[PDB]
Amino acid sequence: CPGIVPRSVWGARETHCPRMTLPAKYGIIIHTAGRTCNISDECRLLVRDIQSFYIDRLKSCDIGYNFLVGQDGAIYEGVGWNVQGSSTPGYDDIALGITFMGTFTGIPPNAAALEAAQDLIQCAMVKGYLTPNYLLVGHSDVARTLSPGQALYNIISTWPHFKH
């Protein structure tokens, strides 16, 4: 199971949103469709920016993703394990939203990032956070959106438990 830089480290704003009880029956991969980051400091600011965006512009209760993966190869805690994401209408409370920071329509995240996400996925299943036969899906498979990019979609569609 990978290391996860907590909200207390990247400077997350304190909230209190809908809690989520595990295990999750879904693992949904997302991309921010925004800029990427490839170093700690940079990535921490990017998650902070994304959160503020969710609170301020969209008026969401918090960042809409359970976890984020910077191209530094680090996993950043979004709302985390126990709190509900808000990116996939209908699925949020039964899925773990894992999103890569950046725009991967024409190019996939570097290997470091990909490794960390899967390491995170495998972990979650092993520890029962994801169900034994969890379903893996891209944002675009359940929600109408370009997320997480054809390039990235090409990769996760070869991953384990990828919903057909």
Residue closer to a second copy, measured from CB, 12 or 152? 152
Cα–Cα distances (Å) from 10 to 37, 48, 50, 78, in that order, read 13, 7, 11, 10
Q: Which range touches a second copy (CB under 8 A), out of 22-30, 55-63, 141-149, 152-160?
A: 152-160
Q: Which of 123, 5, 125 is nearest to 70 (CA)?
A: 5
Distance, in Å, from the CA atom of 95 to the CA atom of 26, rounded to the nearest integer, reads 4
Site string for Ni ion, 14-33 (x = CB under 5 A): ----------------x---
| 140 in contact with Ni ion (CB under 5 A) | no
Give the residue carrying structure tokens 């998650």. Answer: 47
Least Cβ distance, residue 87 to a second copy (angstroms): 24
Rule CB under 8 A: which residues touch a second copy? 111, 114-115, 118-119, 121-122, 125-126, 155, 157-162, 164
